[PDB]
Write an enzyme that holds these catalytic residues in place. Sequence first.
Site, PDB file in Angstrom:
ATOM      1  CE  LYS A  48       5.925   1.182  11.667  1.00 30.88           C
ATOM      2  NZ  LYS A  48       6.006   2.264  12.828  1.00 30.88           N
ATOM      3  CG  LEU A  66      -2.247  -1.236   1.582  1.00 31.52           C
ATOM      4  CD1 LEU A  66      -2.677  -1.603   2.904  1.00 31.52           C
ATOM      5  CD2 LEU A  66      -2.886  -1.561   0.393  1.00 31.52           C
ATOM      6  CG  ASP A 113       3.826  12.352  14.805  1.00 31.54           C
ATOM      7  OD1 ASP A 113       3.891  13.586  14.333  1.00 31.54           O
ATOM      8  OD2 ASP A 113       4.458  11.441  14.557  1.00 31.54           O
TER       9      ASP A 113
HETATM   10  C1  LIG Z   1       4.013   8.898   8.622  1.00 33.27           C
HETATM   11  O1  LIG Z   1       3.593   7.984   7.679  1.00 33.27           O
HETATM   12  C2  LIG Z   1       2.693   6.695   7.319  1.00 33.27           C
HETATM   13  C3  LIG Z   1       2.583   5.964   9.089  1.00 33.27           C
HETATM   14  N1  LIG Z   1       1.485   5.232   9.363  1.00 33.27           N
HETATM   15  C4  LIG Z   1       2.001   4.444   8.924  1.00 33.27           C
HETATM   16  C5  LIG Z   1       0.887   3.903   9.636  1.00 33.27           C
HETATM   17  C6  LIG Z   1      -0.418   2.920   8.306  1.00 33.27           C
HETATM   18  N2  LIG Z   1      -0.966   2.454   9.409  1.00 33.27           N
HETATM   19  C7  LIG Z   1      -2.185   1.536   9.214  1.00 33.27           C
HETATM   20  C8  LIG Z   1      -3.072   0.891  10.226  1.00 33.27           C
HETATM   21  C9  LIG Z   1      -4.301   1.386   9.780  1.00 33.27           C
HETATM   22  N3  LIG Z   1      -4.882   0.630   8.680  1.00 33.27           N
HETATM   23  C10 LIG Z   1      -3.680   1.379   7.704  1.00 33.27           C
HETATM   24  N4  LIG Z   1      -4.316   1.734   5.719  1.00 33.27           N
HETATM   25  C11 LIG Z   1      -3.862   2.201   5.172  1.00 33.27           C
HETATM   26  C12 LIG Z   1      -4.679   2.197   3.871  1.00 33.27           C
HETATM   27  C13 LIG Z   1      -3.995   2.257   3.244  1.00 33.27           C
HETATM   28  C14 LIG Z   1      -2.855   3.149   2.736  1.00 33.27           C
HETATM   29  C15 LIG Z   1      -2.045   2.967   3.757  1.00 33.27           C
HETATM   30  C16 LIG Z   1      -2.395   2.606   4.856  1.00 33.27           C
HETATM   31  C17 LIG Z   1      -0.560   3.862   3.612  1.00 33.27           C
HETATM   32  C18 LIG Z   1       0.145   4.284   3.988  1.00 33.27           C
HETATM   33  O2  LIG Z   1       0.898   3.843   5.725  1.00 33.27           O
HETATM   34  C19 LIG Z   1       1.514   5.180   4.159  1.00 33.27           C
HETATM   35  C20 LIG Z   1       3.402   4.932   4.079  1.00 33.27           C
HETATM   36  C21 LIG Z   1       2.689   6.411   3.966  1.00 33.27           C
HETATM   37  C22 LIG Z   1      -0.672   4.490   1.604  1.00 33.27           C
HETATM   38  N5  LIG Z   1      -2.280   3.373   1.658  1.00 33.27           N
HETATM   39  C23 LIG Z   1      -2.481   3.869  -0.363  1.00 33.27           C
HETATM   40  N6  LIG Z   1      -3.211   2.044   8.056  1.00 33.27           N
HETATM   41  N7  LIG Z   1      -0.429   2.319  10.957  1.00 33.27           N
HETATM   42  C24 LIG Z   1       0.349   3.072  10.527  1.00 33.27           C
HETATM   43  C25 LIG Z   1       1.030   3.011  11.524  1.00 33.27           C
HETATM   44  C26 LIG Z   1       1.265   6.579   8.352  1.00 33.27           C
HETATM   45  C27 LIG Z   1       1.218   7.389   7.836  1.00 33.27           C
HETATM   46  O3  LIG Z   1       0.806   8.873   7.031  1.00 33.27           O
END
Ligand SMILES: CO[C@H]1CN(Cc2cn(-c3ccnc(Nc4ccc5c(c4)c(C(=O)C4CC4)cn5C)n3)nc2C)C[C@@H]1O
Lengths: 264, 263, 258, 253
Positions: A36, A14, A128
């Site tokens: 993650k 993703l 954050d």
């Molecule tokens: C600071 O940068 C980041 C770190 N973090 C990471 C993270 C995601 N998590 C999570 C939990 C439950 N569902 C999701 N769903 C989801 C659905 C589609 C997504 C992403 C995540 C996705 C990404 O994550 C990319 C890496 C950015 C891209 N796409 C298209 N993500 N949990 C954590 C700790 C999010 C943040 O934006």
Amino acid sequence: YLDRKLLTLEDKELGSGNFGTVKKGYYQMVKTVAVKILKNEANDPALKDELLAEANVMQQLDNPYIVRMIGICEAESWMLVMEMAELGPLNKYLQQNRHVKDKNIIELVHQVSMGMKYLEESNFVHRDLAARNVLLVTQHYAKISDFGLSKALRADEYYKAGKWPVKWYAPECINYYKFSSKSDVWSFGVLMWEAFSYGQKPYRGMKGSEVTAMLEKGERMGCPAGCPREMYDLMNLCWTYDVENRPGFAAVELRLRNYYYDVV
Amino acid sequence: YLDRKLLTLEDKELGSGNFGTVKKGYYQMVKTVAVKILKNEANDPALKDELLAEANVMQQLDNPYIVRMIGICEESWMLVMEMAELGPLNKYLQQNRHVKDKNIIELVHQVSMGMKYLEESNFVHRDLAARNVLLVTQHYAKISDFGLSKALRADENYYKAGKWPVKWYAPECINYYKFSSKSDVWSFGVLMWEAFSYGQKPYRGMKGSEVTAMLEKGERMGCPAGCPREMYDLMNLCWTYDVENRPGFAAVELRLRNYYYDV
Amino acid sequence: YLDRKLLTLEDKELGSGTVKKGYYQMKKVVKTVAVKILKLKDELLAEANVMQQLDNPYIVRMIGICEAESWMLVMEMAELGPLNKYLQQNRHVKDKNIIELVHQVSMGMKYLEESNFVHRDLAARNVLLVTQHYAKISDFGLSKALRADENYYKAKWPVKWYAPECINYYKFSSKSDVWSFGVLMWEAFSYGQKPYRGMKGSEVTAMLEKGERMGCPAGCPREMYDLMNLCWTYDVENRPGFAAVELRLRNYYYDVVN
Amino acid sequence: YLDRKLLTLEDKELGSGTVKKGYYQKVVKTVAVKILLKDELLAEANVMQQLDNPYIVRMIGICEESWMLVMEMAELGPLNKYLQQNRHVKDKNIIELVHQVSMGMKYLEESNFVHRDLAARNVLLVTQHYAKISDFGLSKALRADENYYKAKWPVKWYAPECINYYKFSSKSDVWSFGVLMWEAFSYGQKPYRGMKGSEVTAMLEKGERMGCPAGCPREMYDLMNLCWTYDVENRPGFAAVELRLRNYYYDVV
Ligand SMILES: CO[C@H]1CN(Cc2cn(-c3ccnc(Nc4ccc5c(c4)c(C(=O)C4CC4)cn5C)n3)nc2C)C[C@@H]1O
Ligand SMILES: CO[C@H]1CN(Cc2cn(-c3ccnc(Nc4ccc5c(c4)c(C(=O)C4CC4)cn5C)n3)nc2C)C[C@@H]1O
Ligand SMILES: CO[C@H]1CN(Cc2cn(-c3ccnc(Nc4ccc5c(c4)c(C(=O)C4CC4)cn5C)n3)nc2C)C[C@@H]1O
Ligand SMILES: CO[C@H]1CN(Cc2cn(-c3ccnc(Nc4ccc5c(c4)c(C(=O)C4CC4)cn5C)n3)nc2C)C[C@@H]1O
């Protein structure tokens, strides 16, 4: 701690970041999950510490507007297994969906205020709170994630202080390293500005000390195009310089709730 | 004159007095403002006159230690000013008994800087009291409340005379209705005493004629607990009975600047 | 002068002629009015003649006269009614509140004094409350415009509110209204009690000539009782005008709120 | 505490913001069902349980796939939408309906309840000649030691003492009723169109009011302005308001 053999993973990631990778998967407890995955077998101690800390916070939280943790899986690498929010980070979503209506932005940011009001009354500081750390289950349901910097407040206390996201931090964080729910409220104002700016980064082209001087002079980011005045007023209230005159999330949530009911 | 539609106001009032209400707001230019709202639709002609005179003086002033006026807006008459969000100094010190003496010195020195500017601009304030100092932060004070302020004439050293804050007035004001920058220096001495007394009112329980009589006898308010001797001396210097031997604000400012540097 | 068909009246009377609540049409909106309905008519017209000349927030504004089934004086409504009645029913209005109201009266009277009118019936019953924090002066049936060549008007008689020079020489000036204002203050701090209760007009006059005055109402601040006594200065030239009276109340209220 | 198995729901929604037509069990009662913030539905039901009046919507009960509030059906729906779609309802018809509302409010007043959301959208029509009061989500019982309840804010229907002091009484409901009457004679138009809540407050404090709707009898516009009496003590109660509407309807008919 989870069983790697009960976890299955989609091949295409993703997204990716400095920590590694995020993948869609399924876990037999079968729930659809976001995983993650730490890069390079989690050799990096700061990556393991962050995964441990954000997992330990999430375990204590239970709220519809906060991402639920399934568990940790120590397998080919360290893996944090959470409930899937299908649409991903809020800032990336708004960059790709410029059509989202102002009323929709209010609904989403109000839900974030509800999760933060819950965090506030649970004695946790997020530290954050940015639009990239709001994840969309649907276009009408947001959840808060990324608790790697989050702390539980002590009963005799402001949390006194890795990553330092200065553009989201209140003046008392920058100058005194003091973090409170009111510190999160300032960050929430920045987050509201990101959302009405459809995922633009705040203080574009500015260094940390340039933002700090700007704020000390009483200057603030401008009103995003199409942002209703009442919402821009709320941003300025969250950006109240003095900690005691800044509102808490109970007040911020109530103003967003009342304003939403008026929009429709 | 301002556009009411560009002004938004917070619901809960910051304070109130005989004039009406003071509220926090925002005005598009978007600046965070304090708004003085006259009671009863500004029906009282003395309140309207004071707001007009307030705005006319502030408009001519530009100094970092003087409250900046945005303008006037007329559902009621409103005086829109830049926000100093911590509010009146006397109320703040009553609420924050922990403020250090070095911090009091810093704030009162900033007041002397705004008054030195006022003295150089040929303005007398005539209401210089701790309630009319407003805190931007605990380390940045501004002077407000110019409703009694006057511009001195080029052919006069003083203004010869509404409200009568006798407890802040020098003997020449009481006895001869003469107001000068030296008269403001006397009030500044009362202000210092208020600030080192953490917002106590001066001459508690005395009538005007009792304060005037005590001063003619050479008696003065006592040294507030915890007040450095050098500051109480400066209070007594500001309370110099003779107008010509009282220091002006150039000398009062430099004295505060030097004691602050020492501390 | 007003169109009766544009006026509607509530059935129940507000008081006693008769005073009624009603509504008067001006464009798409209705103004809430108090209507004085006569049970001579020359006194209503003289009363309306005075009110037409006046325009001040602390004076009851007249909408106009309506010659219909009865002769009517149509005024803007001050919902809460006579001040003496209000204080008799609200015994716990605060002294700070009373000072605010009497100061508003004094602002209304300073405007009248500046307009060269004498009210000649200034009493608490002729003060009407818009709210508990907003008083207007009513009841101009005895009011007179002073001639440009005279400092007083020389003439029912509300003797208990009248200054000695009114009783003894039939002379009425703004200073004469100041004396009545002193009685009004005493009424206000006595919560609508009648002045000189149990005394005939002749006995009040003799007591006043002797130098005696009504006592200080219980709980009345001494600065306000002093101000009553100053308004009750026997000599007209030494009695304050309403400019001095209003400033006195203005500064004392400022003291009380602070 | 109703049995879901005894309830059936029509497929199409009557309205959203979800409200559905349904049937609740030898005879089956025709019901409207509000289908969902959970605690607030239970409080809404806790109020409706205590009420029993022909001019107030009767609750059948709560059913716990979604949370549901099951009420007797008032088939014609919200009064404001009805009048927006039927512009030729006669003013005699409008008086009949708002008087029925005053009879339900007089019952609430006598039962020491304050509705706190009395608006034309919360009046439902059983027929064109029979209105009921709904939507008790903001309603409060008065404590026996208190004249008012001291506190989502429909500010355009609120009296000044509500706005200024957070105090809600039956007199405050009388104020909203004056606004409901203006809506009814304006055929479902919203009050103070194009005005912010702060602008409405200042106008009211100034002594200004909404104008007389076209075709509104003067006596009914007078009654609106009486309900908009600023001072709470001089504002009529619902006993007086009901009597004014009853006698004026008699005169019309
Ligand atoms: C600071 O940068 C980041 C770190 N973090 C990471 C993270 C995601 N998590 C999570 C939990 C439950 N569902 C999701 N769903 C989801 C659905 C589609 C997504 C992403 C995540 C996705 C990404 O994550 C990319 C890496 C950015 C891209 N796409 C298209 N993500 N949990 C954590 C700790 C999010 C943040 O934006
Ligand atoms: C009673 O006498 C008063 C009259 N005067 C009024 C005034 C305030 N002004 C101003 C300008 C810019 N910022 C401010 N900020 C500010 C912030 C928090 C405050 C107040 C003001 C506040 C009050 O004002 C109450 C009335 C005391 C209370 N809180 C808690 N005030 N300007 C004027 C002319 C000040 C004086 O003390
Ligand atoms: C006995 O002496 C009288 C004569 N005078 C008459 C008068 C009233 N006027 C007026 C104008 C505008 N608004 C009002 N409002 C108002 C509201 C509620 C009231 C009264 C008046 C009210 C009465 O009037 C009863 C008769 C006392 C009783 N209630 C309960 N009244 N105007 C005039 C010239 C007042 C004085 O007290
Ligand atoms: C804030 O907007 C709403 C909230 N409220 C909701 C509500 C309806 N209830 C009820 C009870 C018994 N019978 C009914 N009958 C009925 C008949 C046809 C209808 C509606 C209702 C109808 C609607 O409801 C749409 C959503 C407006 C549309 N059509 C066409 N409704 N009960 C409550 C708490 C009404 C208000 O207007």
